[PDB]
Amino acid sequence: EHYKARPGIASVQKATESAELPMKNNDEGTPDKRGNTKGALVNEHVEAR
Amino acid sequence: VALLSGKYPPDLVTNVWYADAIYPMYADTEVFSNLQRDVITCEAVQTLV
Amino acid sequence: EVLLLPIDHQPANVTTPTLDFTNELTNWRARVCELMKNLVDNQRYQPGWTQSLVSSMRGTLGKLKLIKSMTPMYLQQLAPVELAVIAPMLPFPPFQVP
Amino acid sequence: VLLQRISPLQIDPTIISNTMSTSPASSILGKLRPSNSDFS
Amino acid sequence: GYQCHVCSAVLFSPLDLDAHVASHGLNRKTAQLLHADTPRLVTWDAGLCTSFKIVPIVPAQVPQDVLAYTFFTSSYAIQSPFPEAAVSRIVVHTRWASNVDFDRDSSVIMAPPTENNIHLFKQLLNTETLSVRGANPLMFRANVLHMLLEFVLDNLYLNRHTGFSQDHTPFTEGANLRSLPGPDAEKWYSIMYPTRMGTPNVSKICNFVASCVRNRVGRFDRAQMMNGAMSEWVDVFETSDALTVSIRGRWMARLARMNINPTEIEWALTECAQGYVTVTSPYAPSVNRLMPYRISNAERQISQIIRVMNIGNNATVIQPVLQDISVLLQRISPLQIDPTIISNTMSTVSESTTQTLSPASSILGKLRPSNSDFSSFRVALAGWLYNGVVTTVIDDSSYPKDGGSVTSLENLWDFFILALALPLTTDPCAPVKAFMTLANMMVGFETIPMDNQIYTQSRRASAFSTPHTWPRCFMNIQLISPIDAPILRQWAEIIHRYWPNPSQIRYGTPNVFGSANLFTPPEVLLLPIDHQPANVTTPTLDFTNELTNWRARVCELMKNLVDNQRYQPGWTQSLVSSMRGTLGKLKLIKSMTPMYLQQLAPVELAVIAPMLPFPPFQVPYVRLDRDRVPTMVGVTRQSRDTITQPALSLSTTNTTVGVPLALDARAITVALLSGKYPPDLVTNVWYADAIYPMYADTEVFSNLQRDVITCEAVQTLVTLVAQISETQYPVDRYLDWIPSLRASAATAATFAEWVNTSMKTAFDLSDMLLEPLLSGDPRMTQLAIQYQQYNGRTFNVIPEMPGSVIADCVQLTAEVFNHEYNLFGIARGDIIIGRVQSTHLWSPLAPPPDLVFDRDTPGVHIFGRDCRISFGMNGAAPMIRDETGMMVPFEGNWIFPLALWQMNTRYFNQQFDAWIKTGELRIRIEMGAYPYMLHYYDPRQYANAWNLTSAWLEEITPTSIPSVPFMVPISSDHDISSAPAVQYIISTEYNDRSLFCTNSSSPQTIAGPDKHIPVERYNILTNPDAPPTQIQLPEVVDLYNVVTRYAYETPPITAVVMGVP
């Protein structure tokens, strides 16, 4: 083990582990198995704020 | 202030720094799984419509 | 096979001088400092300054114009290379509008 | 985060202080605050 | 506090008790601007001037059996000039044979080549190298440059004369042999004189010395000037080498250019005193002093520009200088302020008690005569020397609150306080403020046309600070109509008519000193006020100068103001009488301050102005011409992208320098109105007593010594940076063959700081030098200065760069290194990692040309940036991709660049090392320069190189290589047996130059690499037709020369030049 990594493998890989993460799901507004639209009851613009 | 300041290390060679920064990043690739998921995302649309 | 950028890019070398005005960001910093020097120069637009701050203001603008900084050298040479390396490996590949 | 971990650029704000070496000159050192290291 | 002991009286609070006893009785820039460090120029060396020693490596076989022990001169303890050994190298140790008084903490110390010298090449830019034996082959050039700079900055000494003998022995008859001091000297007389030893033998040293010449030994020249004193300089034949003899010779010439005699010190100090202080110099034959103090004017100008760049604005660096000059004027000036003059002359003013104003008593509450007038008046006088940097202005607070009105008596006096103080400032916008204060006193009473709605009449007069704000009604007096503004018309005429005139006083002694001023001619100063010379030496009161005219005309304007029909009936008649009486009283007040400032203060300024740590810096005092008002002054330190010419890249690259400064107009007015003399003084006795004690200082000479180091360091920096990066100045480059990295900004900025530290340590400097040159980009450096008038007419000064012997000697040592690379532990060329197994005894630093190959050799495959390796399936051989698209097996001759191995070191080790050992293929790895390490094996036994070469090949890292090992056979004298030896790493070119002599006591060398003692070095002995003062400098080093040895002495200047008190 003569050569050590100049940016550092343990530093680059720990950021690539969270670049690997997929996009968070957005579920509200869509119906469930019964038929009810899931999510909270709120004004849409108040929710977007 | 990030524009007005900032410097390189006083010993960098780009063919060392980038060859050492690319490899752990590509070692945690997920492109072959994303390309394998996009076919299913494309294929669900016909079975919906 | 294109990646739209709002900055001009040049091929990468590290031996380019820090005070080239071919680099458009360094040119932009220089022109803003020259415009502010013309703004301060003749003491109109600033009545009520009791002392003569024109020499000191012009000197501290000249230092900020002639500061050494490798960030405008970086953004046109090595930042688009790193963006082009990173971009096809992203989980949400880039969505650009011209 | 990943651009900061890959990039060679070391952003330290002390170049401004070494250039100024301290009025209008100290006012920009008040406005820029080079005691900070938050560059997100 | 208890009790005094004169009378038994008890008190409290010892602030009372000490008065009771008296009644019984009666950062960095501030430091460097005043007390800059003094460099150590002159340093003596009583030892012999060499830097190359001869170290033995392997011992000779003194108890051998082929030849008896009585053959050897080691059996008799005979001291020899060269170490007897089987193999002896020459290595580099600066000052192994020296004896100095003040060491320079910089030296090049090398181990012998059997040990490891990698710590001299991993020193500079290797902060990310893991192993303690590896160094980056991209920083070899910067490492070698820093080693050469250390090598010169060590050897900058002077040769010292010690003493001599006469040889009583018949060795070298009648010669005068040097005796160098130290703990012993017996081991030195063989090393110094190789030709002194007798020659009984057919040993190689005795073949040499018997071949040498005889009459060139010891001392052969001297300059004996006096009986019973030192000889001045001698010439000795002794062991030295031409390179450090050349360095110390050029340094001796550089110091001898600066020399001054005791007579010109007298001629300089007499003119600097301008006749008041007379010093003397002896008139006799003397002994050859050395006083290095004369420098050219270009060095003074460059050191002036760097100080002005230090006093880029900062507002506090130059304030202690003005404080120091005020305190210095205190100890000289015979003018003393007397605040009782005004309190006397305002007593007898006739006025009524029934009035409620008292104009004679309002002005004493305005003035408040106190003690601190001096330290606000002499700062205003000291600011006349520094027009270019300091712009002294009247305080913001000394103006009235709302502008005031002329009906206000207190504002009427507050105008009078400013009208006297404003001619003594140094801002160019003083007369417009003097006009605008009265135009603020009169709003509504009478009006004049202005320029805009912004800078109208009712603006505060402090704001008119630039030439653009000067109103058209002031610059053209006809616009003020005398019908409805007669007092402003009259005050404008008084300003345009009776404002003082600039002049010139001629300080300076440009013979010994150098005129450090720019923007002016040398030997001249510029004053704001006109001056006359003193005719009589018994001074007495008169009323004829510009300051008394200026005091009179303001009072007469105020009398014409109180004599106004629009203004007089608002006041009572006794009050008008008292105000007019106070003005007529205040016209003719006796004060010696105007006559002082006219005709006796510029003499003090011209006397003081050379004896000064920060020499003056002025732009021309223009009186009222708006065309030539200086609006800026700017210095540069770098250029733009392309322009290599300062006259073109100066106007767009500068830093504006200059800071304002506040003053007290009330204190200046009190100091002007109240000044008296000693009651019967004579103004030559006063000055011959006062100026005398401060002319035994040496700071005015030591700053001239300092400016040499300041000017030569920037030239050494701009020379040494140009090797590793491109610049604008034309230099030669001798070290392109050593591989270097591609220089960014941070590489040059780091390398320049290491050069700064290597100067600052070696010349005994504790403060900071060339730091503003380090703040910017140090690649493209230039030094220039300019100032600009109002109309855009710019006056630039670009001082030339005189040559620096430090950079001259660094380039000389580079030229010598180009032929003596083998001495500093570097080989030139590249290596071959084939397999050679034979019983031959050729040395791998000088291989036979059968084994090497090149790009021109046919059938040789060349590998570049492309490496694709196909594996060998089903018994077929694996292949690698040629540069020209071919696939070749693992045979033949290959050529690699070193970086190709470095980027793929572990993948190449597992593929290639099994084939280099037992198969056949050769790999020529090219790098240009590499450090080498040696291993001496015995040629009668088996040897193998694999445990060394595999250990070298495994440790190649993408950022470092270790030093390259070799295996050299030990050259025995007598007949030996033969054994197989397996060599792997051979060199390409000749690298066996550091070898000195083989077996050194035997008659010959039968088997092994041999060489005799190099005749081409010892030219002066072996060539009878050569002149003694001959060097062959770029090719050889010659190891034995004539050297001059001085016996000068360096006394302080007050120990030679004495002044009569």
Ligand SMILES: [Zn+2]
């Ligand atoms: Zn007492």
